[PDB]
Amino acid sequence: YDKWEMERTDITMKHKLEVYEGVWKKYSLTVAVKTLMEVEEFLKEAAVMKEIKHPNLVQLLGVCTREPPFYIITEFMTYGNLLDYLRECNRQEVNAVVLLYMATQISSAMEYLEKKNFIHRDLAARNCLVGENHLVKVADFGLSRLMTGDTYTAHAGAKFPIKWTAPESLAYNKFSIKSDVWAFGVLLWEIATYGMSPYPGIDLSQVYELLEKDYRMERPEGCPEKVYELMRACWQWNPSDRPSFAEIHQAFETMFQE
Ligand SMILES: COc1ccc(O)cc1-c1c[nH]c2ncc(-c3cncc(C(=O)N(C)C)c3)cc12
């Protein structure tokens, strides 16, 4: 854990994006810096990121956890968040096969988290980052430890991103890897629509009531049928009926390789 420990003066802040674009001076490397949510939570978040090693999860580079202010230093993704990237892109370049490639990368990251007993709890396009050549990485700053068979119960009075949130979470504050699968389905929809807002115009207070009566978003324009079938599978009411990320990733790698 001290192999990760850095001196605060090894980094220089360049631009404020509390997240900064910074420079790891020794390597002349552009990095992302997060500074200090309570202290212990921040330190645990750093501790968890030390255990994460995957090409499509944002890589930790070092921490400053001796004397305040505390730093978490990670790799820098050139193009920023996926949501704005999709909304502002050239769709002739970011075409159908690129969208499949992005979904494959994200599902690969989630398959890793699934295998390593982590949940994300805020899977969404706004929380994915884009590098050169349509490289996509999931932000892993809010990861929680959880055995995949088990359930996390959010604290009393927690506020959710309703339109990304699984029904069991909206009603009972319960989260699991299956609730991430639901969120992934919404992320797929975001990708397929190049960053449209989910359930357009639908009042937030009626989303749960709609879901329990089996309302789901319709197939986006131009979206392949098999991709929509995957979305719908992710949106099964019963969590145990939803596919695993291993199955989801396998499905996308097949599509992408064909
Ligand atoms: C300390 O790392 C983090 C902690 C919090 C957070 O939200 C993200 C990062 C993070 C890591 N690597 C990154 N690489 C690139 C960018 C980034 C660059 N430029 C623009 C945007 C952006 O979309 N907006 C400002 C809306 C994001 C962020 C990051």
Side-chain angles (χ1 to χ4, degrees), residues 2 4-7 9-15 17-33 35-44 46-65 68-114 116-158 160-258:
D2 179 274
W4 298 98
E5 194 66 24
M6 299 175 50
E7 295 282 0
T9 55
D10 292 332
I11 311 289
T12 289
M13 310 302 197
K14 186 189 287 191
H15 305 306
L17 299 181
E18 282 297 271
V19 188
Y20 291 84
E21 173 183 340
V23 172
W24 198 352
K25 301 181 238 185
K26 179 168 50 179
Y27 298 110
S28 303
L29 179 65
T30 297
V31 296
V33 186
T35 76
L36 187 64
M37 200 180 189
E38 301 296 331
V39 175
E40 301 298 336
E41 290 180 349
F42 185 85
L43 292 178
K44 176 168 185 179
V48 170
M49 294 180 65
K50 295 178 183 174
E51 307 174 12
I52 301 306
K53 189 66 174 295
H54 193 271
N56 300 104
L57 284 160
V58 177
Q59 178 60 46
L60 180 73
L61 296 177
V63 301
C64 304
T65 62
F70 297 138
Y71 290 168
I72 291 178
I73 307 152
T74 77
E75 68 174 307
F76 189 82
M77 309 299 300
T78 307
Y79 296 102
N81 76 87
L82 179 61
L83 180 58
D84 286 331
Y85 182 86
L86 289 178
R87 290 180 171 178
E88 300 173 359
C89 73
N90 174 2
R91 294 196 188 186
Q92 292 296 301
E93 300 311 307
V94 189
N95 50 17
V97 55
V98 174
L99 297 187
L100 281 177
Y101 179 47
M102 291 178 165
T104 303
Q105 291 178 81
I106 294 172
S107 67
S108 181
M110 297 308 299
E111 176 186 12
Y112 175 81
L113 291 185
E114 187 178 72
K116 290 252 297 183
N117 299 313
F118 291 109
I119 57 178
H120 193 285
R121 292 165 57 193
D122 198 18
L123 198 59
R126 63 183 176 267
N127 290 322
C128 297
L129 299 165
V130 184
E132 291 82 353
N133 302 122
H134 308 128
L135 173 68
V136 180
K137 303 200 179 199
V138 179
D140 50 9
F141 300 92
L143 295 188
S144 296
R145 299 189 196 273
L146 184 66
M147 301 302 303
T148 72
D150 295 333
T151 300
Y152 162 83
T153 303
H155 62 285
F160 302 142
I162 298 180
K163 292 181 171 178
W164 284 260
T165 305
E168 63 272 13
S169 310
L170 288 177
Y172 310 105
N173 282 21
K174 285 181 176 177
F175 292 79
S176 71
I177 190 62
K178 293 304 185 184
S179 57
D180 275 346
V181 171
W182 180 287
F184 176 83
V186 179
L187 175 47
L188 281 185
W189 191 91
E190 291 189 275
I191 294 173
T193 58
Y194 289 88
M196 280 181 49
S197 290
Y199 307 99
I202 292 184
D203 300 334
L204 294 173
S205 67
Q206 295 183 79
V207 170
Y208 177 77
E209 308 158 82
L210 286 181
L211 292 175
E212 58 181 5
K213 299 181 180 64
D214 199 36
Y215 179 85
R216 300 295 186 274
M217 288 185 287
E218 58 171 341
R219 183 180 56 85
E221 209 185 314
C223 179
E225 176 56 36
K226 181 53 203 298
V227 179
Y228 185 61
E229 293 180 59
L230 266 177
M231 289 187 208
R232 295 305 298 262
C234 292
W235 297 336
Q236 292 278 19
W237 179 266
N238 187 14
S240 47
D241 291 339
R242 303 174 198 150
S244 73
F245 278 115
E247 295 162 349
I248 291 173
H249 175 251
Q250 184 56 256
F252 274 113
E253 255 292 325
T254 296
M255 284 182 277
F256 176 67
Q257 288 176 335
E258 296 176 345

